[PDB]
Design a binder for this molecule. Structure first.
Ligand SMILES: C=CC1=C(C)/C(=C/c2[nH]c(/C=C3N=C(/C=C4\NC(=O)C(C)=C4C=C)C(C)=C\3CCC(=O)O)c(CCC(=O)O)c2C)NC1=O
Ligand code: NA
Length: 243
């Protein structure tokens, strides 16, 4: 979370850099422990017939968060990606924090962030609903419609192409605000009932299964590493289905 040793960071899109710093700052003083990814993955790169893909993975856990994954990536010289998920411990019933930012030479093309539900009714907990409403409706000029698998995302999900610096900063601040709410809610949460824990586990399984339908991510991985590698990475590293 000291992103000071990151080889990628100095070379990434400025909005990505600010988000990475914001996420690292959110996590820095938590009761962190390492979370070992499959094969204790950290840095990885690959190429097949086209551009090289370079990826840095950082991953932690706390008693409330099963797995806190920050991924940074670059395809060739110019396509930059930040991926982050905080997977909740089902025992505590917290939503899933996620964000995905994709940028090229033309600027940021996609910025997505959410606190996604795990309840069977597909609603966020009452406390989240309240705190999120209090932020107000952000104005963004270029909204994007989620794909069908994106039914997993809350009504507060952002999915935009930022139109200018003001919007980039507004999006980053909204992600900061989501993280602030999420970290606070995490400390007022108690272990839930076995039936409730099971419900929340299912919500997290479903989230991962749906995220795996994102062909935009899959194609980037496949072009650099191939089908089998990409399937392993999506299903075991990015969106692992708990059980
Ligand atoms: C290896 C990691 C990684 C790669 C390579 C990656 C690539 C990536 N994700 C994308 C979109 C996207 N990404 C998501 C969302 C998410 N994606 C998430 O990983 C999470 C946690 C969310 C949501 C919280 C959505 C909704 C789209 C748009 C998909 C579409 O347009 O069909 C796009 C298309 C960008 C655009 O259309 O402008 C690419 C290239 N994303 C990645 O995370
Ligand atoms: Na390299």
């Amino acid at each position: 979370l000291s992103l000071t040793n990151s080889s990628l960071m100095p070379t990434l899109n400025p909005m990505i850099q600010q988000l990475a710093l914001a996420i690292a700052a959110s996590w820095q003083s938590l009761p962190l422990k390492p979370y070992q990814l499959p094969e204790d993955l950290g840095y990885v790169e690959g190429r097949l017939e086209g551009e090289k893909l370079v990826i840095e993975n950082r991953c932690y856990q706390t008693p409330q968060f099963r797995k806190m994954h920050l991924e940074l990536a670059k395809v060739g010289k110019g396509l930059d990606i930040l991926h982050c998920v905080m997977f909740p411990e089902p025992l505590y019933g917290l939503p899933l924090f996620g964000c995905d930012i994709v940028a090229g030479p033309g600027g940021v093309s996609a910025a997505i962030a959410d606190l996604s539900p795990t309840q069977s009714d597909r609603q966020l907990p009452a406390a989240y609903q309240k705190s999120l409403a209090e932020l107000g409706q952000p104005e963004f000029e270029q909204q994007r419609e989620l794909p069908p698998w994106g039914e997993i995302f809350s009504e507060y999900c952002l999915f935009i192409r930022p139109s200018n610096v003001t919007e980039e900063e507004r999006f980053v601040q909204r992600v900061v605000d989501f993280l602030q709410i999420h970290c606070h809610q995490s400390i007022v949460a108690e272990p839930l009932s076995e039936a409730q824990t099971l419900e929340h586990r299912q919500g997290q399984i479903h989230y991962c299964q749906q995220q795996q339908k994102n062909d935009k991510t899959r194609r980037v991985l496949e072009k650099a590493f191939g089908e089998a590698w990409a399937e392993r990475y999506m299903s075991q590293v990015l969106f692992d289905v708990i059980q």
